[PDB]
Amino acid sequence: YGTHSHGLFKKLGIPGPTPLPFLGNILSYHKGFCMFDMECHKKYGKVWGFYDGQQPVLAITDPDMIKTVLVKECYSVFTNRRPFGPVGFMKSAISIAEDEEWKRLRSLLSPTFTSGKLKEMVPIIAQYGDVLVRNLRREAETGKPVTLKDVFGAYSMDVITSTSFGVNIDSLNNPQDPFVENTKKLLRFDFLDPFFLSITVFPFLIPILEVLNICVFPREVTNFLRKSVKRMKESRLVDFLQLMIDSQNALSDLELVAQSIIFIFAGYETTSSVLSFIMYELATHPDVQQKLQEEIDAVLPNKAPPTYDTVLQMEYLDMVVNETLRLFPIAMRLERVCKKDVEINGMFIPKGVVVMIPSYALHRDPKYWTEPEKFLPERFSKKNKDNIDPYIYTPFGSGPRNCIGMRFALMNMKLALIRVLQNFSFKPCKETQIPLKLSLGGLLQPEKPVVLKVESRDG
Numbered sequence: 001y002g003t004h005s006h007g008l009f010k011k012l013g014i015p016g017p018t019p020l021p022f023l024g025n026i027l028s029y030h031k032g033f034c035m036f037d038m039e040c041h042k043k044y045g046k047v048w049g050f051y052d053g054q055q056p057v058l059a060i061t062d063p064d065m066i067k068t069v070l071v072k073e074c075y076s077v078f079t080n081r082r083p084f085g086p087v088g089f090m091k092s093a094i095s096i097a098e099d100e101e102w103k104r105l106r107s108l109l110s111p112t113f114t115s116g117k118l119k120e121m122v123p124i125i126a127q128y129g130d131v132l133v134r135n136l137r138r139e140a141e142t143g144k145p146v147t148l149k150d151v152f153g154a155y156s157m158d159v160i161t162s163t164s165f166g167v168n169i170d171s172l173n174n175p176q177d178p179f180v181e182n183t184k185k186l187l188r189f190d191f192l193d194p195f196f197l198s199i200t201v202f203p204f205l206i207p208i209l210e211v212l213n214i215c216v217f218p219r220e221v222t223n224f225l226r227k228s229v230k231r232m233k234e235s236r237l238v239d240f241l242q243l244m245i246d247s248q249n250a251l252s253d254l255e256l257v258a259q260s261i262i263f264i265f266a267g268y269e270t271t272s273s274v275l276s277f278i279m280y281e282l283a284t285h286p287d288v289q290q291k292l293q294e295e296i297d298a299v300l301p302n303k304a305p306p307t308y309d310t311v312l313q314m315e316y317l318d319m320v321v322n323e324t325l326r327l328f329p330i331a332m333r334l335e336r337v338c339k340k341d342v343e344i345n346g347m348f349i350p351k352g353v354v355v356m357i358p359s360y361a362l363h364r365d366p367k368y369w370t371e372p373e374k375f376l377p378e379r380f381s382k383k384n385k386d387n388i389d390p391y392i393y394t395p396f397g398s399g400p401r402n403c404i405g406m407r408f409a410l411m412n413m414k415l416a417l418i419r420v421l422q423n424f425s426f427k428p429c430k431e432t433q434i435p436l437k438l439s440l441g442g443l444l445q446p447e448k449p450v451v452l453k454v455e456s457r458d459g
């Protein structure tokens with residue numbers, strides 16, 4: 001034994017790279033998820049199959065299917081995601097929860113994300129828009145080429161703490177010692193790490209790990225937020241902990257601690273990561289930074305504070321964020337487990353298989369997109385947009401199980417653009433790598449941290 005599911009795609013009839021005995025196709029991840037997705041797409045068309053060890057992954061590319069599974073069949077057959085490693089009590093974090101515990105948690109926290117409560121958090125978020133620039137200032141002063149993900153990470157931290165726990169620190173490399181270093185440690189998993197590679201060939205190793213209590217969210221940090229939450233509950237006799245406590249807090253109590261940790265996870269390094277790309281695009285395109293920078297002066301006259309409405313009422317900003325997201329869809333892949341045998345717009349799909357949508361690949365897909373390689377915002381203006389197909393462009397997923405934090409993500413990032421642009425300009429310096437080159441790991445990240453010249457707009 002060792003090639004269990006390896007007959008499935010030759011049978012059923014789907015093309016794809018032919019699996020090694022124990023490894024499946026994992027050896028093709030030397031380029032990363034993105035590059036591996038591009039090629040299978042080219043070299044196989046619109047459906048293809050591969051094996052992560054002995055897990056069969058079926059990538060689909062037709063919008064109709066991609067909508068059947070993401071939308072039309074969510075609660076039906078494609079409800080859950082792929083288990084990925086020893087997850088401990090975090091098994092109750094919504095993004096990890098399965099089937100019925102999921103829908104429960106989903107409608108239960110979704111009220112916690114509605115607009116208007118977005119409205120309310122804004123003054124809190126803007127407050128670190130201020131902090132960010134008071135900080136971003138000094139680094140431009142010194143004349144030194146600022147590392148983006150450091151100023152942005154901090155802001156993201158600042159905004160997570162404040163909106164998630166009503167803890168207002170200026171982490172931002174200042175009070176960098178209280179509550180900051182556990183949070184700092186909540187980074188995206190790299191699923192091409194040797195650790196995760198091992199657990200994909202030997203998934204029989206997850207339960208063992210589970211036993212030794214070896215969890216993939218580090219215990220140091222989980223103890224802390226778990227402790228730190230509980231002490232906050234009592235004291236309280238806007239803020240995500242707030243909105244949950246009020247949320248009838250059934251809705252379990254030490255299941256609340258799982259949400260808190262997972263919101264930080266999903267939002268920390270993603271927000272600060274996208275913000276970096278956006279500032280890279282706005283240099284190598286100085287023209288766009290200006291077109292955007294003027295729009296901002298137009299909507300709020302010299303330095304005026306950004307606002308829930310000041311924001312939504314900025315067509316060009318919305319274009320720049322959206323175009324950055326196309327090039328760099330942080331998740332790279334949407335992905336869904338098949339709960340049962342089902343038919344789906346043509347092809348049979350057998351129970352057990354993982355259905356995979358190639359976000360990043362569809363976003364650079366010479367079909368739907370012309371000069372797909374190019375940062376040009378105009379793709380998303382009132383004319384040229386909305387003949388672009390959702391289910392193709394999906395940087396936040398789609399359907400019952402999409403990014404619950406999308407609005408908050410966008411809002412948060414814009415308030416940060418505003419403050420920064422309406423106050424700065426950004427210029428390739430010595431180190432600035434041009435073009436881009438993505439990491440060939442399992443994260444959709446720069447490879448060599450983006451560093452830029454920050455230059456105060458007159459002072």
Ligand code: HEM
Binds near residue numbers: 263
């Ligand atoms: C940089 C911005 C962000 C991007 C690009 C992003 C992207 C995504 C994607 C692609 C998914 C999976 C969608 C699917 O399965 O179809 C997702 C899920 C999720 N995201 Fe985000 N996200 C971002 C920010 C955030 C923030 C700030 C939060 C926290 C408030 C958050 C919370 C979640 C949660 C809880 C899920 C899981 C929903 C579920 O499985 O029921 N995200 N996100």
Ligand SMILES: CC(=O)[C@H]1CC[C@H]2[C@@H]3CCC4=CC(=O)CC[C@]4(C)[C@H]3CC[C@]12C
Binds near residue numbers: 188217
């Ligand atoms: C970068 C990343 O995704 C992290 C999250 C889970 C982490 C692993 C969790 C288990 C672990 C325990 C150890 O004592 C050595 C390091 C390892 C093997 C970790 C290495 C880095 C990983 C793979």
